[PDB]
Structure formats: structure tokens, C-alpha cells
Write a protein that binds this ligand. Structure first.
Ligand SMILES: C[S@@+](CC[C@H](N)C(=O)[O-])C[C@H]1O[C@@H](n2cnc3c(N)ncnc32)[C@H](O)[C@@H]1O
Ligand SMILES: C[S@@+](CC[C@H](N)C(=O)[O-])C[C@H]1O[C@@H](n2cnc3c(N)ncnc32)[C@H](O)[C@@H]1O
Ligand SMILES: COc1cc2c(cc1C1=CCN(C)CCC1)N=C(N)C21CCC1
Ligand SMILES: COc1cc2c(cc1C1=CCN(C)CCC1)N=C(N)C21CCC1
Ligand SMILES: [Zn+2]
Ligand SMILES: [Zn+2]
Ligand SMILES: [Zn+2]
Ligand SMILES: [Zn+2]
Ligand SMILES: [Zn+2]
Ligand SMILES: [Zn+2]
Ligand SMILES: [Zn+2]
Ligand SMILES: [Zn+2]
Lengths: 259, 260
């Protein structure tokens, strides 16, 4: 049963419907869907355009001489992102200071969602997000979008369920509780199929990466998307509830934690 | 003797290309600036971008009704005839806090440039911008885009030719000298066919209106676009050059200066 034809109300490149064939819960409305991060705290991001590293290409930035391409860290594009073996990977997309055209090949994340997703009711994990088409390894899925808040503010938010940390070693957080995009509905999987990548577009302030999800393997039609929320989340939450990802390899179920 | 010397000065950043032609002289397509399609800053502007305090509507349609709390556009994206073209009020477009669909009728400026424009070499005023199509009165043309700076920083800029004052009353300016869009090339006309309007979209920091040009009459294909730069400019620049607008009632010509 279709409870909403587009939770994004046209804010994304494509519609993101919500269905619930499992239970009585209506299409969630306790948040505001936004497609880009909102700044509701006090931080000053360095947006100084003269600070940007930029390329001088006048092709499609598909050559290895593209300076922006060369700045990528712990990852790189083949045709699709690959990651280095074993600190998160950094992508520097082209920006307003680059000489290239708006439609160069180094603007994947800033160009937005391309894959077909659906918000759906899962059996045991509330709302989740699934792929409606096959998605090859290394494909951009969606950004993790919300309010940029400080570490102090995140620690006192009443609900911690929608936080994503921007951590160097001084930390900032993206809180998708009140304002967020489709990513706020992605569950934890102990068997993850997407990974977060730190991306820079309009600014290159290393304290404030944008978080982009890329597939970590080929994903089949119908599969739930999920990332590894990590030990910080589970060390907190496992004292109240345990993982219901249902994987034969689950690391956070009551059974796995007892053993 | 006009051939395209650049097919798109905006490098595909706008919805339509903006070609550059020169049938007057030997000047090359301007390259002493960086074309950008949204405002930038160098030193920090403390824009208040906090979403929780935005005024916003509760429409769940396309904001074509009378009850949209966000007021000035008609069904076609044009300023309503009531709209005071002499003393423009502020426009608050829809934002991320609004309930409506992205594609609603109150996001005209955020949708960007729709009309065909051309950067061209003028006879007597350097580079200028002209319409390559008819533009009905009250149509959005383009935004004045550049580097946001304080009025105090503007007062010390070496070149003041590309400044635009952001009306609030501390005040700010856009400087399009180093970073700007097609608007940086629009000349002064004493018989202007476009007007600037302060607009708020994603934030409502009243210090930092964004400046949108709307046609003030029906404009014909080929007509040079221009707004009235105003007295702050001519009080300064009259002593360096006179107006070449060619208007019959030109208020800033060698002739008019002489009388005054
Ligand atoms: C960011 S929300 C994901 C969307 C959430 N399922 C919903 O319905 O709104 C994170 C919360 O979802 C639930 N959740 C996510 N992954 C889970 C898992 N593997 N096992 C149990 N609950 C999970 C927990 O309540 C967790 O705090
Ligand atoms: C914002 S720039 C407009 C683009 C400019 N024509 C160019 O070639 O780069 C403003 C400058 O253009 C020239 N200009 C603009 N309008 C003019 C006019 N009506 N008469 C004479 N010069 C004008 C003056 O040099 C003025 O400072
Ligand atoms: C209990 O979960 C969290 C607690 C904190 C967090 C991030 C999470 C995460 C929440 C879920 N999110 C979707 C991804 C995992 C990180 N950042 C934080 N600062 C805290 C520690 C108390 C608030
Ligand atoms: C000489 O022209 C200007 C001087 C100043 C200005 C705006 C203009 C304008 C320049 C041209 N622009 C495209 C439209 C008219 C305003 N804002 C300013 N603060 C000053 C006063 C000295 C710097
Ligand atoms: Zn490049
Ligand atoms: Zn680049
Ligand atoms: Zn590029
Ligand atoms: Zn699990
Ligand atoms: Zn409305
Ligand atoms: Zn609105
Ligand atoms: Zn609206
Ligand atoms: Zn004149």
C-alpha cells in the first residue's frame, strides 16, 4: 500500500515513494525533508573562494591531469569509486573556481540522486530504504543531509538516533532528526552495502565534509540499503535494544554480544 | 561583423548558454574575471542561514493560491501589474521550510535564467548585454551575482565599476569585479528597461538581499539591457566619462552635465 508518492516533494532529481505493506504506520511526517544541509548552529565554514583548490581543465575533467581528481584521498574514480585497502576517503569535486564546464565528470555528488530508491516499512527495523534497480559497486546513492551542529549540541539532543559524526581528532555532527533527506531512514546492517565518503564541493573546509553514500558491492533489485553505524552507536544503544538486521553474520544481536 | 567568439561565457552553469559576439573592435572575450552563477565571498560574511526562524508557507500545492504566506508573481512567473516598479518591495520566495512542492509558482529567481541573452561589444560603452528574444514586462532576467563584501570594503576597492549596493538600513555590496555572472556586463541606460529587486530565497538575513533583474517593459529582440545605475555612481563617474546611453533625455551626457 502506497502511503506517499514522493517523500521528497520534488526536491530530488527523482521521486522517492513510501510504501507500507507490513503494518499500520502512516508515512512519517515528524521531520522536514530537505535536500541540502542546513546550518542552525554557530560555526563559520571557510567559504573563501580564493582558498579553493581548483582545476584548469577545459575538457570534461576525465583526464588524470585534472587537479581536483588528483586531490582525492584513500579512494579514486575508475569509471565509479574504488577505495584503498584499510581514516575515511576524501573526494574533491570541481567547484565555482574550476575552469571546467558545469557538466564535467567530477560532479557526481553535487549532481544529486540518480538511482531508484523507496522508503518502505521493514519487518523489525521500522522504516528502511531499498533499491528499486540493480546498483553496481561504486555508485553514488545519496548524501547524508541534516542540521550541522556542534559536538556539545549533539550530546544533549534528546534523540540521538539520527546523528552522523564529522570527526577528525574538535568534532561536528549532522543531525537528521528534525530536518533530513532519505538517508535518515537508512538502517544499520552488519552486512553493509553502502559506505560513507567525505566529499567537498562548494567549499574545502576540512572540518565540514559532506557525507556521500556509495555502494560497496553490487546491489540487487529490492535489497535494503544499510551502512555500518559503528561501535559508538552500538555501545550506546545495545544497553536498550539489540541488532535485528537478521544477518547470519550479525555482530550486534543479543546472541552475538553475549558470546 | 558578428561571429560567436565564445559559445557560452557561463560554461554551462546557467540554464541556457550566454554567447559572446564582437562586431565592433578587436577586443577578445573578457577573461579578467571568473564567471560564477551564485554569490561568493572571500572574507567571511556571517549570513544567518538558520532554517528554524524562516517565514514559510503551509501550502501543499504549487503556491498559486491567495493564501500562500510567502506574494508578487503571477501564474507565468511575472511580477503582478500592481508591483511597484518604481519603488520595489522585497520578495520572499519559498524556501526549505515551506511545505510546498519544489516546483511551485513562488520560486522564480531560484529557477535561474530562462531568457536568451548575449554578451556583445557595444559601439561606445565597452561590453554590454542584449536580449536575443522578446521579453514581456515583469519577467525575471538574471541575478546580480558576485562577491559579497561590506560597504566599508567596497569604499576601498581599487575598481568600483562592478559594485551593487544592498539596501537595508551597516550595509553590504556585491562586487562583481573578480567573480561575477552575466550581470557584470549590463550597462547604465537613462531609459532603463530592467529594474533590480531585492529577493530572499534560502535565507531571510535582511542584510543580504539577492538582487534580481526584472524587465520593466516589453523588451524587443536585440535591445540592449540596462538599469539606472543611480546617483551614487554618476556623482563619482561623471568626472571620468559621460553617459553614452544615447537616450534623447539622457540625464548624464556631456550635454546634461554641462547644463548642471
Ligand atoms: C537513523 S534511524 C533509521 C530509520 C529508522 N528505522 C526509522 O524507522 O525511523 C536509526 C534507528 O533505527 C533503528 N534501527 C536501525 N538499524 C537497526 C538495526 N540494525 N537493528 C535495530 N534497530 C535498528 C534504531 O531505532 C535506530 O536508532
Ligand atoms: C558594470 S560595468 C558594465 C560592463 C562594461 N561596459 C564592460 O565593458 O565591462 C560598468 C562600466 O561600464 C561603463 N559604462 C556602463 N554604462 C555606461 C554608460 N551609460 N555610459 C558610459 N559608460 C558606461 C563604465 O566604464 C562603467 O563603469
Ligand atoms: C547513539 O548513536 C549516536 C550517538 C551519538 C552520535 C552519533 C550516533 C549515531 C547515531 C545513528 N546514526 C544514524 C549513525 C551512527 C551514529 N554522535 C554523538 N555525539 C552521540 C554521543 C551521544 C550523542
Ligand atoms: C562608482 O559606482 C559605485 C561606487 C560605489 C558603490 C556602487 C557603485 C555602482 C557601480 C556600478 N554598478 C554596476 C551599478 C551602480 C553602483 N558602492 C559603494 N560603496 C561605492 C561608493 C565608493 C564605493
Ligand atoms: Zn578538471
Ligand atoms: Zn575542478
Ligand atoms: Zn571539472
Ligand atoms: Zn546485525
Ligand atoms: Zn505557498
Ligand atoms: Zn513558501
Ligand atoms: Zn511554494
Ligand atoms: Zn544616458
Amino acid at each position: 500500500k502506497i502511503i506517499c508518492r514522493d517523500v521528497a516533494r520534488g526536491y530530488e532529481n527523482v521521486p522517492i515513494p513510501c510504501v507500507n505493506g507490513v503494518d499500520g504506520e502512516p508515512c512519517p511526517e515528524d521531520y522536514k525533508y530537505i535536500s541540502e544541509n542546513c546550518e542552525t548552529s554557530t560555526m563559520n565554514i571557510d567559504r573563501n573562494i580564493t582558498h579553493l583548490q581548483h582545476c584548469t581543465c577545459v575538457d570534461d575533467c576525465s583526464s588524470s591531469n585534472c587537479l581536483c581528481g588528483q586531490l582525492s584521498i584513500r579512494c579514486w574514480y575508475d569509471k565509479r569509486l574504488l577505495q584503498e585497502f584499510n581514516e575515511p576517503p576524501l573526494i574533491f569535486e570541481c567547484n565555482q573556481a574550476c575552469s571546467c564546464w558545469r557538466n564535467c565528470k567530477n560532479r557526481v555528488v553535487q549532481s544529486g540522486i540518480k538511482v531508484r530508491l523507496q522508503l518502505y516499512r521493514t519487518a523489525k527495523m521500522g522504516w528502511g530504504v531499498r533499491a528499486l534497480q540493480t546498483i553496481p559497486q561504486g555508485t553514488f546513492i545519496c548524501e547524508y543531509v541534516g542540521e550541522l551542529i556542534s559536538d556539545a549540541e549533539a550530546d544533549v539532543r534528546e534523540d540521538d538516533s539520527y546523528l552522523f559524526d564529522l570527526d577528525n581528532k574538535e568534532v561536528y555532527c549532522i543531525d537528521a532528526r528534525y530536518y533530513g533527506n532519505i538517508s535518515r531512514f537508512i538502517n544499520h546492517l552488519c552486512d553493509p552495502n553502502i559506505i560513507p565518503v567525505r566529499v567537498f564541493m562548494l567549499h574545502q573546509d576540512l572540518r565540514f565534509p559532506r557525507i556521500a553514500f556509495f555502494s560497496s558491492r553490487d546491489i540487487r533489485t529490492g535489497e535494503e540499503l544499510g551502512f555500518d553505524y559503528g561501535d559508538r552507536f552500538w555501545d550506546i544503544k545495545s544497553k536498550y535494544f539489540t541488532c535485528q538486521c537478521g544477518s547470519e553474520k550479525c555482530k550486534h544481536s543479543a546472541e552475538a554480544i553475549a558470546l
